[PDB]
Amino acid sequence: ERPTFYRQELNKTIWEVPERYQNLSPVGSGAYGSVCAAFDTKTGLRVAVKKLSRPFQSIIHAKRTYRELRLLKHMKHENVIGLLDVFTPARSLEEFNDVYLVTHLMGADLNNIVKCQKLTDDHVQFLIYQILRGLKYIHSADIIHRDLKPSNLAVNEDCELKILDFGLAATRWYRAPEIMLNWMHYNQTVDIWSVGCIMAELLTGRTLFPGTDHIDQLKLILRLVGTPGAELLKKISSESARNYIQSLTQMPKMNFANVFIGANPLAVDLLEKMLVLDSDKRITAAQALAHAYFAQYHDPDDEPVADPYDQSFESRDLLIDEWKSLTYDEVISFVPPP
Numbered sequence: 001e002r003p004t005f006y007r008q009e010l011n012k013t014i015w016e017v018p019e020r021y022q023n024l025s026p027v028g029s030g031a032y033g034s035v036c037a038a039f040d041t042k043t044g045l046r047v048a049v050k051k052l053s054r055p056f057q058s059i060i061h062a063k064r065t066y067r068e069l070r071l072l073k074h075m076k077h078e079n080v081i082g083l084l085d086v087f088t089p090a091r092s093l094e095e096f097n098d099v100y101l102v103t104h105l106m107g108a109d110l111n112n113i114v115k116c117q118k119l120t121d122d123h124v125q126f127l128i129y130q131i132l133r134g135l136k137y138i139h140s141a142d143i144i145h146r147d148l149k150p151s152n153l154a155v156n157e158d159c160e161l162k163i164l165d166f167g168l169a170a171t172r173w174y175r176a177p178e179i180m181l182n183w184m185h186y187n188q189t190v191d192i193w194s195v196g197c198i199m200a201e202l203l204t205g206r207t208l209f210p211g212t213d214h215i216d217q218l219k220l221i222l223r224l225v226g227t228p229g230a231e232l233l234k235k236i237s238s239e240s241a242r243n244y245i246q247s248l249t250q251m252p253k254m255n256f257a258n259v260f261i262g263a264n265p266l267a268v269d270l271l272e273k274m275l276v277l278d279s280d281k282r283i284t285a286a287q288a289l290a291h292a293y294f295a296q297y298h299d300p301d302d303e304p305v306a307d308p309y310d311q312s313f314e315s316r317d318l319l320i321d322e323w324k325s326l327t328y329d330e331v332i333s334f335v336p337p338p
């Protein structure tokens with residue numbers, strides 16, 4: 001039986017949700033719609049509810065809506081956000097215009113927990129191990145975040161973490177330089193770069209690359225990692241592209257031990273492996289988990305990978321109505337987790 005729904009205005013938008021979700025409180029806007037904290041009267045737990053913004057307005061919005069719902073329905077890991085529920089106030093495909101997604105709230109994001117504090121080495125080990133374990137899983141399904149930052153990390157009172165907003169792509173401080181140089185031949189280690197920026201900041205209490213704009217962001221990144229070496233310059237196919245980066249003023253690579261003074265030598269070594277300018281030489285999520293830095297947390301028998309994920313829809317050029325219908329079927333066939 002279809003639950004009883006109720007209307008409420010929040011941030012100049014109507015929210016129509018089942019009666020099971022009580023006390024909606026706005027927590028901000030997060031990936032193509034706003035998010036409310038709510039109390040789930042069925043479980044007694046606190047949930048995050050997202051109302052997608054104009055999900056079937058255009059073709060881009062309709063495909064993005066399908067992409068997100070398909071991703072959420074597949075993702076089943078401790079350090080990756082999962083779907084608790086998906087609903088629409090619509091009674092038919094014809095009336096179907098709104099999509100709401102329900103996940104765990106955890107408590108807060110990584111920014112409100114760290115709040116620019118210099119964290120202890122063991123605390124950093126726990127936080128980074130969790131992000132990496134989550135990324136290993138996401139990456140094994142051929143899914144990348146491409147915009148990982150502290151605000152996409154939902155964290156518990158016990159510092160248990162879940163990654164949010166992966167597979168869909170604000171601050172540019174955690175962005176891989178290859179994305180900003182628009183190399184468009186990049187791999188899964190764009191996420192590893194972001195992990196490196198986060199880890200350095202948790203260790204030092206300061207943003208590693210706090211650029212003021214697009215130009216300044218690259219300038220700051222190249223000051224630490226250096227201008228591209230001979231090996232990386234040979235890999236640039238377009239001469240216009242090779243002429244652009246080799247005009248950003250030469251910079252030698254800094255020794256990280258002379259930058260992160262007093263830090264655990266194993267933390268310095270892992271940062272060297274995470275913040276390599278050449279994406280082909282940058283460490284993977286799986287390799288990073290096996291690094292000596294995580295010796296206390298690493299368990300090769302409890303670092304699972306994802307089941308095969310069918311994302312052939314990505315190559316398809318369909319009409320709004322076809323993406324809408326495909327999304328509707330995914331809503332009605334949703335099985336809540338145990």
Ligand SMILES: CCOC(=O)n1ccc2ccc(C(=O)Nc3cc(C(=O)NC4CC4)ccc3C)cc21
Nearest residue numbers: 028029030048049050101105108109154164165166
């Ligand atoms: C926006 C500000 O939010 C906060 O400050 N937050 C603090 C804790 C917290 C927990 C969850 C959320 C949140 O956005 N949840 C969510 C994620 C996805 C998601 O990750 N989707 C992509 C495809 C994988 C889809 C649906 C929801 C409900 C926000 C949260």
